[PDB]
Design a protein around this ligand. Structure first.
Ligand SMILES: C=CC(=O)[C@H](CO[C@@H]1O[C@H](CO)[C@H](O)[C@H](OS(=O)(=O)O)[C@H]1O)NC(C)=O
Length: 156
């Protein structure tokens, strides 16, 4: 409900960048982009740091996959080992279609909407205060990355 504040337009992919502010409850991450016609998958990762080796922990891996029926895989990476996947089969992403992802950080979970329709929840596995880095990888065109805040949904 606050005005969007974009940090970057048209970032080169893979993108890695520092998040300006701590992801307190009510924070919104807003990502606009387009799925190329040949995309197999892309991901948005909320990371504890940016190291590639040992690979930084990923508090929240949000991973649309386009083969077969399509799905979104969510998971957490700790010390270079993935945990148990949570798979959402009702996916709104399609090759050759554009999207607006809104990741809402709540007290107990992430709530993700795409094109304004609720898509999935992911309970926190590590504290969101450990997140300082946003990564975007794979086959995706990103138009903008920005941050907002909602006091309404801040406590729910
Ligand atoms: C098709 C592959 C598999 O199931 C496993 C798990 O596949 C991983 O699944 C994770 C989410 O659980 C990440 O998506 C990850 O991708 S990564 O580039 O972020 O590291 C991806 O390989 N793969 C193996 C045994 O080799």
């Amino acid at each position: 409900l606050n005005n969007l504040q974009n940090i970057i337009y048209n970032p080169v992919i893979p993108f890695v960048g520092t998040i300006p502010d701590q992801l307190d409850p009510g924070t919104l991450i807003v990502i606009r982009g387009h799925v190329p016609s040949d995309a197999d998958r892309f991901q948005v990762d909320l990371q504890n740091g940016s190291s590639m080796k040992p690979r930084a922990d990923v508090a929240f891996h949000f991973n649309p996959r386009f083969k077969r029926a399509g799905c979104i895989v969510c998971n957490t990476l700790i010390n270079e080992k993935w945990g148990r996947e949570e798979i959402t089969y009702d996916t709104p992403f399609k090759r050759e279609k554009s999207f607006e992802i809104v990741i809402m950080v709540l007290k107990d979970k992430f709530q993700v909407a795409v094109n304004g329709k609720h898509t999935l929840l992911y309970g926190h596995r590590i504290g969101p205060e450990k997140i300082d880095t946003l990564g975007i990888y794979g086959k995706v065109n990103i138009h903008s990355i920005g941050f907002s805040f909602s006091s309404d949904l801040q406590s729910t």
